[PDB]
Design a protein around this ligand. Sequence first.
Ligand SMILES: *C\C=C(C)/C=C/C=C(C)/C=C/C1=C(C)CCCC1(C)C
Length: 265
Amino acid sequence: ANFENFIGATEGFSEIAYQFTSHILTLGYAVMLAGLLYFILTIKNVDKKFQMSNILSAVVMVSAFLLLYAQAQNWTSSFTFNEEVGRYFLDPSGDLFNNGYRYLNWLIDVPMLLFQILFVVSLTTSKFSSVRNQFWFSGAMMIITGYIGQFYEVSNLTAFLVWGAISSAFFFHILWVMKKVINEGKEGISPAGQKILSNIWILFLISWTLYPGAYLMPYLTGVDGFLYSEDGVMARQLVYTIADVSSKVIYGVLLGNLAITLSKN
Ligand SMILES: *C\C=C(C)/C=C/C=C(C)/C=C/C1=C(C)CCCC1(C)C
């Protein structure tokens, strides 16, 4: 299937690479449930006119909690310990590790996370429906073509790469359109609100860029380097979790802070 199952069935996993990976993944959906409560409880702190952004964050948490829980359970019960060798190996009587849960979660979250900014800042010369369509199209295509390259990950590396680059073309359009959005949104508002906007732009840039870095991770030290191992498995799964907390939770907190800042007058 994937590089994970390859390692789980060629070399297997050490006790620590298995446990660590399960612990970080558990932490991942535990944070989503925490955020879900944060965004519901604080929805009263923002004016009626920005609340849609709290609403969109609440829903992202519901799906992120739900699907990252599935993934977590999917990693723990796909490998079983072998007393003879002392590692964890892919269990042929299980379901095999499946990263589909996480791609499904992106296909849902991406439109919302992109849509919700447009309820906090105001455009100037760009049209709302124009920006929204461009966000929804390129973001959908970024995930679909990423999913397709994800199949060739362990077999045909070249297709894994050509498809990853296509998905990168859509990624950069989004980065261009969000650039234009944050600029127009800075026009008018107070200097404090521009400060928050700039933070949001810095965070949006890093947090989304971690994702292709975790897509490629087991190849960044070569077709037989240090990461082509349970360590790249470990590391790709740590970067995703860092990325999920950044692009889903912290992003939405900053938008709420921005909404609040924009009610001073
Ligand atoms: C959970 C929320 C979000 C916004 C997830 C975003 C995921 C990405 C930006 C993924 C991007 C990819 C790219 C650009 C190319 C390689 C394949 C990926 C799907 C990892």
